[model samples]
Target: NDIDETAATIDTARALLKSFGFEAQRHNVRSAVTLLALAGLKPGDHWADSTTPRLGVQKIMDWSGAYWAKPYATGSREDFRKKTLRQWVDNGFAVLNPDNLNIATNSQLNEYCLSDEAAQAIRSYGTDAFESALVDFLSKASDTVRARAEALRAAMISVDLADGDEFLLSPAGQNPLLKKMVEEFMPRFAPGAKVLYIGDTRGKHTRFEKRIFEETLGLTFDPHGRMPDLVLHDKVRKWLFLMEAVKSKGPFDEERHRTLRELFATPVAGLVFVNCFENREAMRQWLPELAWETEAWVADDPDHLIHLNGSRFLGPYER
Candidate 1:
């Protein structure tokens, strides 16, 4: 009774995914079969490490034992590609073909298999070792999935810097706005300034130039200190610009300015603070709240800075 055996295997697979922290009702039996590679097999079928298979969503659907199984709803087959399958690959139960790094993301040829850890666990399903394998996967499941999800959410995108230079920036939080501050704001406002630090959602030092900070500027940064969204040094004019790219977060209010001043308590160059926004409307919301003796600039207005009370324009002034 192959049908009877398939039904039992589906139950077993479902238990596996639940143990790994996925909700049962939403993931459903079809997803479990897809995860286990047990679509058309009977009770006695086998998949050993010696001969593992790389499966695509189309193949996975076919393997589900449901005569009517097919790709789920959407414009593209990517419905599962972006949804369930993506989660499978991310959580480390499966491996997206390391052999084909250059494959198009949307290609129908995209294939996957149980990760080494998962394959080992799956291979021991009927044996005494299965429980031990299951335990290992379960214990590490949360952290593994958490790290993968964070990386997926903080995925880096490239930006072209001035004069043939290129930089990679995460699209998380205020970074997209931070990128504009680099590619658009800096070139127009603080031309010739060298980038020394770039704060990120992931690492403390996204594009840190320690030598530039230490030797050139005679300054050392605290690893625990709150860094500005972007830091630049204009050596010729002896000015240091500490900028905050505001989007859905706080601006450089009075307290933030004071904290920054204390952080760079004895800087080599004069410290200038700026709150960068995407447009005048963005700046308009922050204008009344911006700190005096600092400056504000919009990415759209490339030619000017909105000076917030000081005789100096676009340069650092003593507070």
Candidate 2:
């Protein structure tokens, strides 16, 4: 009775994809079948989570019988990655280079795996709990699922800023130093200022205190402008501090200083440009570009300020 009961399993996979808002067309069904089969599932095999080895197009074809009878044309394989796997990864059910997300997508060595939680959810295949688990997972597909996974991976880190407030930073950028700029640099320099804008690698303006600058300065902020790492306004002094916290990038270089000046040309208050660094060592790389009239602070030496322009002490210049 080995009459390809696996054929029946393909329909189940097709239905699963359809329920997830994926089209249940013939091509999509085959791709779904390939994914399920590659996970090493068989009819009623205690359902869910295979070793699920990472696979490329060739390995996917070899593992799933749907295409073993005839190889996918080169164009077909390309579409499979761009269309199927790309959507699955974006929606959080699958991942490329599960252990190393930074691997180039076009690399010949790239491989993919269904996420562990997604694999566990898919395990509900023949159970009464199948629909519930799947629905719960899919409901959170947009962000909750990704947030949960990211938390489990501990990829994003939380650090305490001045005034004991905590901020979340995506570690994909120079955020470790951004953390210092908050905890060490800000507390020492701009003591009571509010964090107006904080740039993030994930969302660019992850924490833009919207309209604070515009309202205070009575000027528009260019949404397309490349902003600094941090922005703070000293209410008492009527000054806006535009600070760059750098670990490996240029600080208050002449070009950047000029650009910010033009960006906030009509600020009602005095505009202060301050550059921050993780340490003196990190600051050395941009020494030549450190512009006159900007202030610099190093996190490693938290209590001191280096007035880059040979200006009077740590406060804003009277430009």
Candidate 3:
């Protein structure tokens, strides 16, 4: 039988992974490539620093054939690889694949349900036995080998899944578009701007500086809460760039959303609130709901961000 565009792209990306020796780090590259292919992109010859694929994820869709694959969010028995990924997570090691692997594996039930945290909480004879159960059932090798299998599954989890909550909120943390924007556009737009801090794009800001929430600054005044994902401080402009990543849930809309406007007001530099998103559809869905005077940074573009002031579309941003 033949294959569809999506399936074919997935195969091509998988082939690339197989060529790389199947190491856990290679799994991340393949996952990134999978999302890139789904989005119809390819990686160019750039570097995130001066060495890596700073080329950005657009290289996936920008290229021919398999480059456009976005990460599969939902996996099923029908698809071979995602099926394997799912089976490995469930029976083998109980690790969940981030949606960036493929949309097919993105569902909350199949993908998010058997997450690593859930697996961690499973009742077992002992940590060693639990790990042994996975390795024994999955690998059936020595205890050490079984431990390696467990470790591999744990390591296989994408940084998106590593963060858990923030990863699943908007764009599902696996949007190829986001990779594109981060790897490609940022250099062109906010060139030379160093990242002082960042975690999951949907991640919360640090609570190190103060004890209570700073409502005077719009923070809850609570001792602890979710922090912002990106805090891009510009030494040149002297600005405090506060941003949040969106995957599924957020008060990005009118009814309910995490607000960043007030928290960014403090400090010496000016305040800039960026709403990092996964795709255009997601942007359209959530961008408008953002509070007035804030900005929007769509992760799908990666190369550049849209600054929003009211309904106006500003320049490709620098924060």
Candidate 4:
């Protein structure tokens, strides 16, 4: 009986998402289950009885397992957040962290729920007035939703390079730190350096300068190799700075330093390994782990640099 109810409800949820103009991927069972959980709809509940319950991805998974007998794997948390809920929030189908607007995006307290208008429209499902209610909701919400999504896009962190070219990084995660490394760190240290590569939180190597890497630097671009957050080339000094913005991982530790050395071994310019941090406090935790003959920079104090036991200051050492 529970299985039948779950199957039916999942189907209804999928149909509801389709009616909301969600893409084909969002019509999947996972998205349907996520939508149902966000709406606080159990298998036996009517669409008219739907209620918005702010729920984290873990809580949504738990709710789905408890009520629908469909448990997602633990590692699927990112799928629920990025693949399902992100689209929901972007498309105005749901709202994120309504209770606390200032909560960090990566915080465990981050939660999502159906928007008031979306909840209202969803509640009209299976009723005689469903079509008209859905039409009315879409008409009133579409423009505002589009505007809000555009506002979010416009708010992305813009990184301006020395060459007058620029790109945007997503406003969260290590991107803000990466932005600081590009804008603050470069001007202070590697002035007039060309940005050869910039790794984004969303996608890696999206802003790579292929010609510079292949032709000028005489280096093969290996996609499989772990790339640093940013790569800068100073033509005047003939120095190639392979820098990592340390937020969660990938500092210029011994292993990573070795890997980068081998990866960029044959570069035409002298290699400069650098570990960048938001501030000294952030760098303290990774201090012991940083490799010798490398550099460390703090964004907050952009004027100074820390050399990790090199014979010379701020220059490449021969392997």
Candidate 5:
């Protein structure tokens, strides 16, 4: 049954994609833009339109605009030209990586696209010599390596389980902490509860790694692979808990809720999406960030669920 559901979801995605004009699963630079646009994301370059993000197609265009000659098109839709996309994310961030200086954009990105490991690899090979030896990895690197690198770098932001301790304590840690709280303490009531996950689902080579302290949380800490700050799983009853880790201000407010809508996207059936607030102050700050479609859960108690957004999506289910 689970496999069937998964298979159906995949098929549904493929079917839905057809409407956007893509015939095949072309998960590349342009395709990502198409997906975001389909998700109704209209990110702009100017500060007024910067509401999008410094990542994704905008990021790619910001760097490699000169190389792009066209926008992706299939049957009906046409996206930003390649050059335009390059001009998007790679804007003058003023950070440099060892990869071909001009080819790469920022230090964070160089670390992302090439993989944090690349730096160490380059260092081992010789810092001065790393550029010449690894220039190809960024521009013309092997397909497998590029894919892996993107996977490693996929995340709205990342944090290491070290030095930067307590960063996740407040809003940033909202999703993660909520998941942990429900899983560990509210077990009896957290029926079929799951963690809500978010961030860049499409893998890109732009580096944006947030270092965090480990030994603090028991998560899949891969020094290489990027981890979503929030991961919700229904551990008990029959509710899928959607969660997001809040950091800056609060979780994505009503306006930014659409991003979550495009990402999780599963029908809110027997599910509970949550914006795990750190505390009262965080919640106060989180109020303004709400978007149009943010329907989440607030853990009212171990046995009951309260509608975070006033929707009857999940429960006041008794434990």
Candidate 6:
């Protein structure tokens, strides 16, 4: 009985989504299930009782399994957000982080919910007033969705590179630290250096110079390799600065130092390892784990370098 009820509910959700002007691809089982999850609806639940519930991708997947009996794989988490929820939010059928506007975009606490207007219309399903309710909601949906898009675009962080190029990074995560390292650390310490590689928390290889890494440096490119957050080459000094922008974790620990050394063993420029932190307090947390003969710099104090070595200061070691 539950199986049949769930099937009927999913079919009704898909049909309702189509009536709301969603594309054919979006009216599928996946999107229908996601909509039900966000609305806190189960197989036996009436459309009149639909309630908006803030849910993350993981929570939505769990809800799908618990109520709808459609369990998704762990790896399909990205698909749930990118394919289903993204369209819902962009179209004003759903709202993002309504519980907390200040939560970081990349935070685990980020969540989605059925929009209030959309929820009201959805609750009118199976009733004679449903059509009029849907019309009223759709009339103002575009304006609401456009305002949301503009707010999100205004919050993006901009980083200017040494090569006169600007990069737009999402606000929060390690992006702020990466921006400081590029705009502050490089100019103060490694002046006139060319940024060869920049790894992002959202996506790897945000500013990768493939030709220079492979041909000029004669280094092998491994897509799966653990790359440093920032790679800079000081042409005048013939130095290669492999810097890690430390935010929550990942400083140049002993193991990471050894691995990077092996990765760039035969690089064209002399290797220089540096760990960058937002402030001295953050650096203090990872100080015990930092490798000897490497350098540490705080963004707050951009001029000074903390040399974790006995032989030399800030320069590469001869191994």
Give one digit per residue, the lDDT tens place, for model 2 in 1-319.
Answer: 1111112255556644544444434226556656665576554443444546687765676556453343565556666677677767777677777668676876645678877656766665433344445656666576644454445336566655434345556776677877777767766767787777666644422455544655767766654567787877778787788888764556778888888888766646788887877788888888888888888887778889887654244687677
Candidate 6 lDDT tens digits, 1-319: 1111112388778866765667666789999899889888887676776888788989999999999999999898878877877777777788889887798665556799888778887886644345457766676666654454345446667677655355556776888988999899888888888888775655422556655777888876564466888889888988889999885666888998998998887646789999988889888889899999899998888899898877334578679
lDDT digits (tens) for residues 197-282 of candidate 5: 32322221111121111121222223234333444455344344445545554565654455444443443334344565534444
**Candidate 1: pairs in clash:** 39-63
Residue runs of model 6 more than 4 Å from their true location after superposition:
1-153, 203-205, 313-319
Note the Cα lDDT for every prediction shown.
Answer: 0.64, 0.63, 0.39, 0.75, 0.34, 0.76
List, residue by residue over 1-319, the lDDT tens digit for candidate 3.
1111112233433432332224344345445343333233344311111111212222322333333434333232224235333433444333443444554444433332223322322222111122333323434323543455445445332322111211111233533444433445445555554443344333221212221113322333222334455445555776655656665655244322234444445555576666666656777777557765666765546556565555355557788
**TM-scores, all models, native as reference:** 0.48, 0.50, 0.37, 0.52, 0.29, 0.52
Candidate 6 clashing pairs? Answer: none
- Count clashing pairs, candidate 1: 1
Q: Cα RMSD to native, each candidate?
A: 17.9, 16.9, 19.9, 16.7, 17.5, 16.9
Instruction: Find the 10 residues in a row with the least total lDDT in model 6.
Output: 1-10
Clashing pairs in 2: none
Q: By the TM-score metric, which is better: model 1 or model 6?
A: 6
Q: What is residue 86's positional error in candidate 5, in angstroms?
A: 45
**2 or 3, greater by TM-score:** 2
Q: What's the best-to-worst order under lDDT? A: 6, 4, 1, 2, 3, 5
Candidate 2 residue 36 C-alpha distance from true site, Å = 32
Candidate 2 ranges beyond 4 A from true positions: 1-154, 161-165, 201-205, 247-249, 310-319
Mind giving the per-residue lDDT tens digits that candidate 4 earns over 1-319? Answer: 1111112388768766765656667778999898889888886576777888889989999989999889988899988888888877776788889887788776656898888778877876543345455555565545754454345447777778655355556787888888888889888888998887776755421455655677877887544456777889999999899988886765888888888888787647889998988899999898888898898988888899888874345677689
Q: What is candidate 6's local distance difference test score?
A: 0.76
Leading candidate by lDDT: 6
Q: Could you tell which candidate, 5 or 6, scores higher by TM-score? A: 6
